[PDB]
Design a protein around this ligand. Structure first.
Ligand SMILES: O=C(O)CN(CCN(CC(=O)O)Cc1ccccc1O)Cc1ccccc1
Ligand SMILES: [Cl-]
Ligand SMILES: [Cl-]
Ligand SMILES: [Fe+3]
Length: 498
């Protein structure tokens, strides 16, 4: 079975509704469904299902010329009518897509002919093409598979145009994909991919050592990092670690005592020994982060000043703000109140817990009492949406989302970043500038607005950046070098070539 592989994922791929979110998995939606335009590593898009496009002078009306040779995997044609019908299906559920500003920008979509698709926007939104390139929601399912002329209430078969077809799924067991033998583009070398559902990282590593699976591919949570390092020395296996793809950080609640105080947030940003954290909890496998976005992120090379590990300075900042230590005690107090902060995280995530214990210890050394609140996922998501946290673990979203889409979403009240920022006097100005930057085509003004937003978020110490994390791979050697997709959340199975 040289052209069949077995891999794993912590959950099933879901129903593969192209227009909905969890329990659908972004990498599996991208295996079956395709965009008008495809994201590239240099930050551009190339023609995909749209072979070319034009736009009006005011940048609000766009017209795409679609390929005329593409079929859905069930034989039905892909054309401008089918594409228009998918946009209607997505936007009939608009409210759900509020995080993604293109969904509020699209005013009209219509098929002018079988090959001409016209999209009209509210404003000259600059990230238009990059948001059409995302895994969801602007993909394409055969309209025959709508339920009652819609997708927001479910689909029939998950029929896309892409290079893989879902063969079958068994909840809590496995998902099987096969190559689309009528694909309009390049045939994948691999014919069949089985996903074993294996939620625990330790069990994933055991499945690979026993040879039950051929490939693990994921972020820093993929398997235990000590095990990963050991596998990278084991000549029977192959391992890889990409260049960093996004940031992991704490979000600090500027609207909740005592993180509502700038001096407290500044002191916390000097309290953590990040290098030690990464060598201790992560096994030396990741990068230290000093700012929300790494300097290599577009529009984020700003010369922002790092807060290096400096307990002396953290203590001095707290002392100056009136948080001093009472005879007998190791925890500071101001106005009778102890310097106590709750750090919420997913209680069953061993790596998260690991990091939280380190953060609690480092902060105790400067006289902050961090209480760890480890809870199930739904509970932590609820806290993020509603600002019920002191500090929370968080992360950015990688290319092509960083920085524009991650910033865009800071305006949405049901997101952790809005909630963390809600206490800032300049929050309204930041949100107004985020709206401006997304529609600004004066390149000078666009860079100025990104520098201002990112600078204010850095100076206000809203985040405690921890690490810039990478994608990791463990594979049987016979699979060869495993590529990495331009979009951080996709897996390029079509590029694997034993
Ligand atoms: O991740 C979130 O904060 C929420 N999601 C929206 C934003 N995410 C992109 C995506 O999921 O397609 C960001 C995102 C980017 C990169 C990897 C994973 C991601 O989840 C899901 C959701 C949508 C509507 C209402 C509630 C939740
Ligand atoms: Cl999920
Ligand atoms: Cl402009
Ligand atoms: Fe999401």
């Amino acid at each position: 079975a040289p052209d069949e592989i077995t891999t794993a994922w912590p959950v099933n791929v879901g129903p593969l509704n192209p227009h909905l979110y969890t329990p659908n998995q972004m990498f599996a939606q991208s295996m079956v469904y395709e965009p008008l335009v495809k994201y590239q590593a240099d930050g551009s898009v190339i023609p995909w299902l749209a072979k070319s496009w034009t736009h009006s002078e005011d940048g609000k009306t766009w017209t795409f010329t679609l390929r005329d040779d593409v079929k859905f995997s069930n034989g039905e044609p892909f054309d401008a009518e089918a594409a228009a019908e998918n946009f209607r299906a997505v936007l009939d559920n608009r409210q759900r897509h509020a995080w993604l500003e293109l969904a509020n920008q699209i005013v009209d979509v219509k098929a002018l002919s079988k090959t001409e698709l016209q999209i009209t926007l509210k404003s000259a939104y600059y990230p238009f093409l990059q948001e059409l390139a995302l895994p969801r929601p602007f993909r394409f399912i055969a309209p025959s598979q709508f339920k009652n002329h819609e997708t927001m209430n479910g689909i029939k078969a998950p029929i896309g145009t892409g290079p893989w077809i879902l063969q079958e799924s068994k909840l809590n067991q496995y998902d099987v994909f096969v190559r689309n033998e009528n694909y309009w583009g390049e045939k994948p070398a691999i014919k069949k991919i089985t996903f074993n559902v294996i939620p625990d990282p330790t069990t994933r590593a055991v499945a690979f050592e026993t040879g039950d699976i051929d490939l693990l591919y994921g972020n820093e949570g993929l398997l235990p990092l000590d095990t990963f390092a050991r596998f990278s020395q084991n000549p029977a296996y192959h391992t890889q670690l990409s260049q960093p793809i996004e940031t992991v950080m704490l979000a600090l609640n500027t609207a909740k005592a005592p993180t509502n105080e700038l001096a407290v947030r500044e002191a916390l940003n000097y309290a953590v020994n990040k290098k030690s954290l990464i060598d201790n909890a992560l096994y030396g496998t990741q990068q230290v982060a000093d700012t929300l976005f790494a300097p290599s992120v577009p529009y984020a090379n700003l010369g922002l000043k790092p807060s290096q590990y400096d307990p002396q300075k953290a203590k001095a900042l707290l002392e100056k703000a009136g948080w001093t230590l009472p005879a007998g005690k190791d925890i500071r107090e101001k106005n009778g109140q102890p310097l106590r902060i709750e750090l919420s995280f997913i209680g069953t995530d061993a790596l998260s817990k690991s990091m939280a214990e380190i953060i609690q210890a480092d902060m105790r050394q400067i006289g902050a009492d961090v209480s760890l609140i480890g809870e199930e996922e739904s509970s932590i998501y609820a806290r993020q949406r509603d600002g019920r946290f002191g500090m929370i673990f968080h992360r950015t979203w990688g290319a092509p989302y960083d920085p524009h889409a991650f910033l865009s979403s800071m305006r949405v009240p049901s997101h952790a970043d809005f909630q963390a920022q809600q206490g800032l006097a300049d929050k309204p100005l930041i949100d107004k500038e985020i709206g401006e930057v997304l529609a600004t085509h004066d390149e000078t003004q666009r860079q100025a607005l990104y520098r201002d937003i990112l600078t204010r978020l850095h100076d206000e110490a809203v985040y405690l950046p921890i690490s810039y994390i990478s994608m990791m791979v463990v594979s049987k050697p016979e699979l060869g070098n495993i590529p990495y997709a331009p979009i951080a959340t996709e897996i390029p199975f079509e590029q694997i070539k034993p």
